[PDB]
Ligand binder design. Structure first.
Ligand SMILES: *[C@@H]1O[C@H](CO)[C@H](O)[C@H](O)[C@H]1NC(C)=O
Ligand SMILES: C[C@@H]1O[C@@H](O)[C@@H](O)[C@H](O)[C@@H]1O
Ligand SMILES: C[C@@H]1O[C@@H](O)[C@@H](O)[C@H](O)[C@@H]1O
Lengths: 196, 201
C-alpha cells in the first residue's frame, strides 16, 4: 500500500562514474513489476532506468550533473506510482575509510591513529567528517567515539588499559556542502597496548 | 566619518563564461569608497584549494577560475592586508548573471502580417545555466514614453503588425535571467536594434 523509498548516491566509484541506489522502506513490497526511473539534472539525456537486483535498484553512470534536483519515480508499466525530487549531492554515502594504522610513539607516550580516504575528500577539500570508534576488544560494551575532519588522531597511552587488545574502526559522513549518510565502517584494526 | 557600511559589497557569478571556466565579480556598493588597501578573497566550496584571491581591476574585483564547486556557500571577504574586515557567505549558483543576448534580428513577413524577432545566446550551449527567461523590450524610436515587454524562454518571438504603429521606427533589445535551479540577476541588454514597420493603406 505504501511505495515509499530512500536512495543514496556515491561519487566517483569507478573512475569518473557515480552510482545511485534505491530501495523501498518496506522490505515486504513485491518489487516484481515495479521499476525505478530518474529524470532531470542529467547530462544530455532526459531519463535513465535503474537496474533491479535483489529488491535493490542501481544505476552506475557519468551522466549525473550533480547540480540541481532530479526526479526519481517508482513506475508500474507507464504508470507513475510515487515520485521524489532529490538533489543527488544531498544523499551521498561516502566510500568507507581504509588502510587504518596505529603507531606508538614512546617519547610522547601516545598512539597515532591514521586512516586513508577518497581521492575526492582531497579534491573537494574540506567536505567529510570522520567518526573513529574504539573499545577494549572484549569485556567493554560500548565504543568510544571521536569526531574529526582530518585523517590523524592521537590517543594517550595512559588513557587506555595496559596489555590489552583494542579494536578500532572508522567511518565518514558528508559534513560540508554535500549532505548524506554514514559510510560503511572501515575494517577493524586490532592492537595490543604496552605492558607496564 | 568612515563607517563599516562603507564596505558593503555585492557579487555576480558567470558560469562557463569562458569554455568551462567561470568568473566571479565583486564591487563595493558605494562607488566612492577608497579601495586603496582593500583586496577580496574567496574561501570554501572550491576545488583543490581552500582560498583564492581576486584581481583588482579599477574599483572592480575579479576572478576567473574553473575551481568553483557550485555546491554550497563560499565565504567572500574584504581583506585589509591579510586580515578579514567583513565577509558574506554566498552560494555562487544564486548570483548568476547571464551573458547578454546578441545578433538580434527582426524581419517583416508579408504573408503573415507579423514580424519575426530572433536572437542568440551563448547559454544555449552551456552545461549548467542552460535555462533562461528572456525579456524583450521594444518602443518607438521617438519615445521616453517607453517600453513594451515580452517574457519568453525561447529565442524566437512574433510581433503582430496590427499591434505596431505603421511607417514607424522601433527600437528593440533583449536581456536574460536564470530560470531553472540557478538564480541571479538580469544580464546586460543586447545592443539596440532598429527597424521600421511598413506603411499601411
Ligand atoms: C571521499 O571518498 C568517499 C569514497 O571513499 C566518497 O566518494 C566521498 O564523496 C569523498 N568525499 C568527498 C569530499 O567528496
Ligand atoms: C583503490 C586504492 O588504490 C590505491 C591504493 O593505495 C589503495 O590501497 C587502494 O587499493
Ligand atoms: C559571439 C559569437 O561567437 C560564436 C560565433 O559563431 C559568432 O559569430 C559570435 O561571434
Amino acid at each position: 500500500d505504501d511505495y515509499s523509498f530512500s536512495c543514496y548516491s556515491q561519487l566517483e566509484v569507478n573512475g569518473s562514474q557515480h552510482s545511485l541506489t534505491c530501495a523501498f522502506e518496506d522490505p515486504d513490497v513485491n518489487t516484481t513489476n515495479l521499476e525505478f526511473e530518474i529524470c532531470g539534472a542529467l547530462v544530455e539525456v532526459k531519463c535513465l532506468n535503474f537496474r533491479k537486483l535483489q529488491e535493490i535498484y542501481f544505476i552506475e553512470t557519468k551522466k549525473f550533473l550533480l547540480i540541481g534536483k532530479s526526479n526519481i519515480c517508482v513506475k508500474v508499466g507507464e504508470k507513475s506510482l510515487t515520485c521524489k525530487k532529490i538533489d543527488l549531492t544531498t544523499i551521498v554515502k561516502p566510500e568507507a575509510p581504509f588502510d587504518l594504522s596505529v603507531v606508538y610513539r614512546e617519547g610522547a607516550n601516545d598512539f597515532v591513529v591514521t586512516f586513508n580516504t577518497s581521492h575526492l575528500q582531497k579534491k573537494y577539500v574540506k567536505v567529510l567528517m570522520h567518526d573513529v570508534a574504539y573499545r577494549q576488544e572484549k569485556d567493554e560494551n560500548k565504543w568510544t567515539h571521536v569526531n574529526l575532519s582530518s585523517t590523524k588522531l592521537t590517543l594517550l597511552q595512559r588513557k587506555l588499559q595496559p596489555a590489552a587488545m583494542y579494536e578500532i574502526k572508522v567511518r565518514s559522513i558528508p559534513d560540508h556542502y554535500f549532505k548524506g549518510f554514514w559510510s560503511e565502517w572501515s575494517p577493524s584494526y586490532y592492537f595490543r597496548t604496552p605492558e607496564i
